[PDB]
Symmetry: D2
Subunit: 258 residues, 4 copies
């Protein structure tokens, strides 16, 4: 099946930033024709740890910016919602509506996304066990969602640390397509992440077997207004994608049937 | 004064709230040194299953809670799940409760703070004790002056929560601390036998209040049936923690 | 029942150190007649993280020193063993043979301690679940142990951190007397512990209900050759004991029947 | 060359070792680029129950292992549990294995190092990856020159282990790293369905070898019956990880 690569800057710092990253993602989409690229960027970081951290420029501005990326590059779009009322307006541009990890159990939010007719990707909560995502999928199907994804992004392991239990991939695959979040899984919650572990863990993900990967990427991560310690330098995206496609190919014959 | 937040998990009916409200009113008159706050949720917005009980809506809930306050003169507290709910809930709620999964949702915290009411945030199962400092800062920036942080367990492997009592003294540095005796022993996706033992630990360590879900017939409760405390056992547990607190308070560490 | 207080310097730095601490423990034993005091000190720290850390002066020297404490103060003695051959020689002086947390599953060590006729106290491994101590007790009873204790000393919680799940107290009480280790439960494994949490957690232990407490104490912890960050200053011992006896008394009527 | 440590969990009989040894010898001839090491324990010294199978003793075990080496020319490895066992086990064991629960026992490590043999330490379920540096230092101080560290899972709540693959690159800084594919999925006090998936992850991340318990009829094994790999499936898994390693190795990070 066509492998999914969800990538883009963590936050919509500006429409300019989006177009710059979008241009590169479009270039890669022309090279890796076996991959379905989906451009991602949040119009609002509604759960920052600090009240002083960057959040965004609003839903209106964000949707407009994402619409520009789609119009200029013909790329599919995904962004996350935080409250039920945002589902409808976001659905006007987003091909995939993303549900934040902390909100994976909020029934009304899931239902709001599901009734839009768009695909829905739920980030698995850091508090959730793999088998408990079955009910998350059930809620979505109940709400009308026909294309559902579950994203592995790490599990609470002691304080300010996340561990990736790769057994979650084959478990969740039982009821939905599975995406591996390569950048959030190495973040150290409330720590201030370890970028040195992004590549090795993404290699593990495709060796185990998943339906796609999620990666935050920015031209200059150190200057990012969010996830500055974990966003992947844009220039490194192509090489990482080539590597995972190669590993996926050689491991694919061994992927177990669900 | 020591706070005791109690009531049925969900507003299954105003009748249920009245029955429980009558008992909490009685204890309220018996333990004058304790500040009682009646609690019940108008909506269980985060149930695991789509087929589980959620409630009768916000309007019916605020109505029933209004009835408890008017008929018994008890303070009220209930939780909100989206920003728009803050204002209407504040009409009756003396303390607005923020769900554990939603303790990092900035707009929900700000919305609650804006009402002028007290705010009690359930510490997320994913949050470290020291990371609650930023939660308090959001509420203060939002205008809140009476702020509570509630210990309700931390993710410990799958489908299990552990109470790290070191959290009580840590969180006390920036807010009043409440110990949730019923959700702390629940097994996500619990054991009532551990409720009393751990609540005794909480007061021995030192906290500003305790939170307990109580129901006349927990077995029939439409929510948290395995952990809600039988109404008839509430008085005994309250007297027990007051006695333990009386002796232990001598040793509570300064701030 | 008579509450147990197991206390003493972590390691047998010298026979002098033992006598100094022993004198204070003897004084307290005369005051707190409702408490059964047991003097503790390790003749060898056989599991230090670093090869460069202090271990001890040998079994022979240690046993001799402990024998001096018992002879001079009439105090019961306890120390830990690391290999089966040490059980017999240690049993000559130790009233209670202690089994290290990492070795709580080593069948031969438990059996070696059990056949001596002495009481045996097993530190619950940081990897062990409360209900899995039932088999530990079974092994001991099988080996002839008639007086058995299980000691709560924390559980692995992420990296370099331990958490005390107080539910373990009533669970383990089902099959053995339970001791709460107040100083090791706050240590941060391979961290370099937080002494500020020793007192609050010990208060929790007696409120929940246990059969005794274990505390490492040293005249000048900062100068200790082991557990310098967690050993309780000797001058603070009396006050801590008074406090837990007071809390135990008021909470005792509520202790659940196993 | 890549290391593959395999064999039945316990020496249930020299006959069993011979049957498994014959297959490992065959694969040894098929995969010349791989260094095979035959493994089996002469004693399961840490069983949960006093009534569980331990083995036939050290003498019978070393005897059977000697038979495997002599009859097949395969390297040998078995674990020790007390210091005195190091010398006699070293008579046949090319690699002395240190149990996970015993990875911090200084005298056991030194005893193993003194024999002059290679030493493979199972990382304790309680140990952080970076804390294995001190384990290596003990062995070096003891005279060991060939040192391995084996990833076998970390305590994750109760009766569960999680494999934090970040450990592979971290431990590689100071020793050769082996991934234990069978114990990493066992549930303390497991699921065979996760063995292959995680071993694929291990080679994709990068390691120096893999450890696998294999038995002709795992269902009848007297130890780790729920996780031992059926002998007939070993060849396929080895070929699979060699292919994945061949492609993935291009991306292994430098030291
Ligand atoms: C909050 C934002 C976010 O992800 P989580 O919900 O998994 O943390 C994101 O991908 O932008
Ligand atoms: C969801 C409801 C709830 O608490 P948590 O947010 O701590 O789970 C409650 O107290 O009703
Ligand atoms: C190793 C020494 C030791 O305890 P643990 O086994 O619980 O760590 C002790 O109390 O001396
Ligand atoms: C006990 C035996 C054992 O391994 P651990 O020490 O990792 O559990 C083994 O590989 O035989």
């Amino acid at each position: 099946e066509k492998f999914l690569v969800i990538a883009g800057p963590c936050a919509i710092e500006s429409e300019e930033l989006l177009l710059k990253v979008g241009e590169e993602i479009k270039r890669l989409s022309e090279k890796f024709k076996e991959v379905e690229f989906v451009f991602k960027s949040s119009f609002d970081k509604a759960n920052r740890s600090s009240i002083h951290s960057f959040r965004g420029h609003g839903l209106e501005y964000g949707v407009k910016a994402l619409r520009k990326v789609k119009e200029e590059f013909g790329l599919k779009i995904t962004t996350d919602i935080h409250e039920s009322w945002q589902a409808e307006p976001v659905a006007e541009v987003a091909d995939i509506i993303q549900i934040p990890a902390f909100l994976c159990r909020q029934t009304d939010l899931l239902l709001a996304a599901a009734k839009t007719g768009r695909a829905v990707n739920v980030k698995k909560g850091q508090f959730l066990a793999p088998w408990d995502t079955k009910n998350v999928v059930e809620k979505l199907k109940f709400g009308g969602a026909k294309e559902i994804y579950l994203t592995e992004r790490g599990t609470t392991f002691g304080y300010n640390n996340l561990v990736v239990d790769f057994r979650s991939l084959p478990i969740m695959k039982q009821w939905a397509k599975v995406i591996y979040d390569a950048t959030h899984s190495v973040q150290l919650p409330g720590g201030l992440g370890m970028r040195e572990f992004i590549f090795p863990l993404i290699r593990a993900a495709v060796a185990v077997g998943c339906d796609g990967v999620f990666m935050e990427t920015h031209p200059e991560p150190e200057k990012a207004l969010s996830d500055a310690s974990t966003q992947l330098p844009l220039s490194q995206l192509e090489g990482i994608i080539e590597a995972i496609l190669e590993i996926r190919e050689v491991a694919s014959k061994y992927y177990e049937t669900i």
